[PDB]
Design a protein around this ligand. Structure first.
Ligand SMILES: Nc1ncnc2c1ncn2[C@@H]1O[C@H](COP(=O)(O)OP(=O)(O)O)[C@@H](O)[C@H]1O
Ligand SMILES: Nc1ncnc2c1ncn2[C@@H]1O[C@H](COP(=O)(O)OP(=O)(O)O)[C@@H](O)[C@H]1O
Ligand SMILES: Nc1ncnc2c1ncn2[C@@H]1O[C@H](COP(=O)(O)OP(=O)(O)O)[C@@H](O)[C@H]1O
Ligand SMILES: [Mg+2]
Ligand SMILES: [Mg+2]
Ligand SMILES: [Mg+2]
Lengths: 371, 48, 35, 371, 371
């Protein structure tokens, strides 16, 4: 039958049917539990709001994220997320539809074991497959080789791929993505006096980050320009109607991606991670990799990130060699889009994990059948 | 062409040759009429 | 005068009558010293 | 006059007085710089912690290794290391004591030029000597001939020496030693969910490697035993009080010494390096090297490395003659012990490098004097 | 030229000289204005009473707190507070005396700009330094490492410092202290029939909180004992001669520090904030910070709070490691005592903000000269 693609991302879950180009159900992965005292009788109000329902009524809810740094913390919340996306958003029976899953590199293996156990016992499927997200991002670009910097909501990871084969030892991971940028933006909005402490306010700061933040091409000049004149100041309207204005915080926030020492991380920026990932590979396969930077992830939506990426890599690279940053406009959904591409092939049909294979091999064939 | 037309680099290596020929007096490397390119990276080795 | 002030140096039974050469005597001494 | 023996290895500097059995000053070669902000004015907040102080206060220090892959890369850090090991550890004037030093095989000549210029211009000595580490290890083994596999923190080099003649063409070098094992152990601990990304955590993972890791006698049987029963799992207490438990990572980490394809190197294990060193020798002297396989360096401290090494050579070499592994218990300090043997010799008075030789022949007489 | 230390806290302004033991002038920070009609002509009718005069005549005054949660709201009232503490309490010319002010961390920067502008243009000084209060508490404690929980009347903040180095990413701020406890104590004092609505009655409920309240070791057993027997009930005499009797409100009032969901705030208690600040620190230094929990501020005057902090952290910490709560008997004025220590430090003379540096850099050097 028609397959499903469910990118169970760290901040947003993108589900939809195979063969399609637009993901049908994009909704944030949150669980909203009430905290105040109910006074209505009539029931109706649930003890847990999941998805857009928790977003709409967020002023009276504690929001819990089940996924933290690409690791599912609360399995009951993620089961509720899976139940909501199977039964309410997409409205499909799980036991009659193939379903493709995505997973970040260098994960703990027991997380994959538990996802395999839930997808074969609770929401038991005819078949499923667990695959690396950067591979599917490269498959969205229509190319076989290249390097993917996937910067999601918990994990920013670099994966170089040669001829459809992801090189395992050269893949690196950095626990710095959109939630940490949101927390740093929440930290630096207190300088202007705008306090944000609740989990509901994190969505407002995230919306500020989505709508107004941008990557500076040169950070020091953008400091000098924003401190000099109020040209880069931009105003935002809050849900209660207050208008804030932010200046340098539009580009102090994504600069944590290029300077992780702002939030105390010792590790280097994403350009250095990309460069050292490429120097971890062989020399002869380097010629594909500098010319095929395919950026992906929701954090890569900031509209100065491609030129800054090209500038930092061309500063780092040997000068004799082409740098090309392929940044497609739909690279937020490139995990889902590439999932639809891979799930809509007759060549993929022999690669599925049937229920019978799960029964003879336990929930441990996912470490063997899936690379 | 800039290295061909560099006037200040003869004056600089003349000064470095004078200072080095003063410095290595009494050694076999003294009374030098010239040196290699890699002398410039070894200039910071002799510290006060 | 400044160069001499700054970069100048601040520091202003022998025979063993062995008939053997240095190599075999050195090998013998290293071989003897383990005991 | 007592000489000084100071092996300036990649891992730990081992220094002490000559004519002795044990080095008095063993300390790791790190330079620690604070990455955070000081607020507490006074009390000697010194900007660059060296050695044991950098080890003790390592939770706020970015640690840098001056010696990387047996090559002195950072020179000011190495000068600080030499200053600490002379003035603070031994507390002796350099101008009244000879100082023996050690060096890796196939070193660059300008490295020897720079070490000679530092040992005669900054730290003035009456005399000094540079020797190969394998030669001193063979001297502390008490034998003039033999093949030495010295595996430090960056370099695993094979050197065969016949009757004091160190064969230059048969020396080879493999860039796989203890720091690479520590980085691989950081990589494979993330499967169990333990994250170690900082340089401060490298000392903790290195201590885990020093305390718990061991060389498997057969790798596939240890896979079968580890997958079958959880008897080989061992628990370790972190400095914050948390307790981890590691399973197969005790012997998957030293197995990189026999299988470099784990971290992605095309070269084979140290056994094939030893064997290919043996075929580069004359066929008359190969018999003596088989019975005289000497090890040195702390990467040979794993308590299963000798029997596995004998098994690997006996598999590689023809079984017609005898194979023997020389593995003394004090082979960690056998570089220092061989230096202490060589320093207090009556013949060694005429192979000293005087200041008059330095003034006549530059910092270049070490090339024509030493091997 | 001696120095002044003026902790301009939210509740109690504490000022005195440098080098002295006890703070010379401790008085509450209130500006009181008359609200009735003055009928008796002459008599020197003040338009505003500041300090202890406003405390004594509080029955005919609207009292206003100029500082709210560490942010100065009304600047004319705070100017009158500084005018009172200079020209009436200490009787000193500020033009011949440097001044050390204290500030909560994560403050609005424009607040710091405005104390700089007023303190250099209205009460113009030779010098002034703005310092974090927690560093001063660690000064008065005398130890170099330690985590400091400072809880004044408006701000409860955790700052951890290891070997002279603060960790700014692990600093956290919570706007919950004694003013909110006073308001909550009113709100639970309405249960027994005692009404308190005016600004004068804040002083009476604050005195009730100071004199009778205490931190329970176990909240549930203290609830059961106060519900069962009337042994814990205590009587207090009002200024009009009436006698109130309070029971469980002695330990339901400070429990908001351990359970902030009483007043509806989403964030967790002060012990969870301390533990999360230690987990935000690096893994090597947590051994020092567990053993050196330094409390300060007048909110920790309750005579059960050290045992509760020890019990909660020992519950949260691993059981292989000691917890020690450093609670000096004079920890109310420890911010002032550490300020007097810092102003008497000979090293501190070089980082005074001079008037010359203020003129040459605008009011902008206080972001770069201070922390
Ligand atoms: N238009 C946008 N501009 C900036 N950031 C965005 C935008 N859209 C999404 N993001 C960030 O990306 C995150 C979602 O990224 P996503 O691709 O879903 O990663 P993952 O799939 O790993 O969760 C959101 O939390 C948000 O912060
Ligand atoms: N007991 C041990 N077990 C396993 N490995 C060890 C042990 N002691 C030291 N090592 C490793 O071997 C190295 C010892 O250093 P050494 O060989 O003496 O000098 P260097 O490696 O610096 O040239 C260290 O880097 C350490 O990682
Ligand atoms: N004996 C006491 N018992 C309980 N709480 C007290 C006691 N003394 C003072 N407090 C509380 O502590 C606060 C004083 O702390 P402090 O740091 O001096 O505040 P500020 O400096 O902001 O005026 C007062 O607001 C009061 O509510
Ligand atoms: Mg993603
Ligand atoms: Mg060594
Ligand atoms: Mg206070």
């Amino acid at each position: 039958t028609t397959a499903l693609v469910c990118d169970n991302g760290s901040g947003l879950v993108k589900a939809g049917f195979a063969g399609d180009d637009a993901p049908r159900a994009v909704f944030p992965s949150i669980v909203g539990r009430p905290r105040h005292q109910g006074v209505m009788v009539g029931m109706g109000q649930k003890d847990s709001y999941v998805g857009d329902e928790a977003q709409s009524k967020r002023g009276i809810l504690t929001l819990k994220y089940p996924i933290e740094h690409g690791i599912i913390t609360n399995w009951d919340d993620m089961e509720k997320i899976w139940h909501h996306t199977f039964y309410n958003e997409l409205r499909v029976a799980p036991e009659e539809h193939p379903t493709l899953l995505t997973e970040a590199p260098l994960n703990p293996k027991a997380n994959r074991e538990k996802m395999t156990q839930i997808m074969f016992e609770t929401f038991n499927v005819p078949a499923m497959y667990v695959a690396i997200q950067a591979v599917l991002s490269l498959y969205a670009s229509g190319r076989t080789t290249g390097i993917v910097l996937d910067s999601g909501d918990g994990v920013t990871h670099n994966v170089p791929i040669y001829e459809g084969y992801a090189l395992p030892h050269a893949i690196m991971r950095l626990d710095l993505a959109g939630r940490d940028l949101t927390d740093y933006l929440m930290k630096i909005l207190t300088e202007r006096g705008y306090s944000f402490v609740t989990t509901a306010e994190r969505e407002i700061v995230r919306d500020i980050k989505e709508k107004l933040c941008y990557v500076a091409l040169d950070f020091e000049n953008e400091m000098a320009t924003a401190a000099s004149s109020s040209s880069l100041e931009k105003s935002y309207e809050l849900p209660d109607g207050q208008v804030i204005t932010i200046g340098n915080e539009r580009f102090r926030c994504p600069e944590t991606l290029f300077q992780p020492s702002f939030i105390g991380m010792e590790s280097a920026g994403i350009h250095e991670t990309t460069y050292n990932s490429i120097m971890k590979c062989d020399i002869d396969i380097r010629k594909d990799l500098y010319a095929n930077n395919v950026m992906s992830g929701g954090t890569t939506m900031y509209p100065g990130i491609a030129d800054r990426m090209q500038k930092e890599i061309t500063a780092l690279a040997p000068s004799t060699m082409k740098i090309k940053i392929i940044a497609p406009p739909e690279r937020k959904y490139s995990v889902w889009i590439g999932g639809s591409i891979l799930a809509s092939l007759s060549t993929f049909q022999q690669m599925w994990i049937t229920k019978q294979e799960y029964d003879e091999a336990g929930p441990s064939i996912v470490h063997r059948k899936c690379f | 062409e800039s290295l061909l037309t560099s006037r200040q680099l003869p004056i600089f290596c003349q000064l470095i040759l004078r200072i080095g020929n003063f410095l290595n007096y009494g050694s076999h490397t003294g009374d030098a009429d010239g040196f290699k390119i890699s002398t410039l990276l070894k200039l910071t080795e002799t510290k006060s | 005068s400044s160069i001499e002030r700054l970069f100048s140096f601040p520091a202003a039974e022998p025979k063993e009558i062995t008939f053997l050469d240095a190599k075999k005597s050195l090998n013998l001494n290293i071989f003897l010293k383990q005991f």
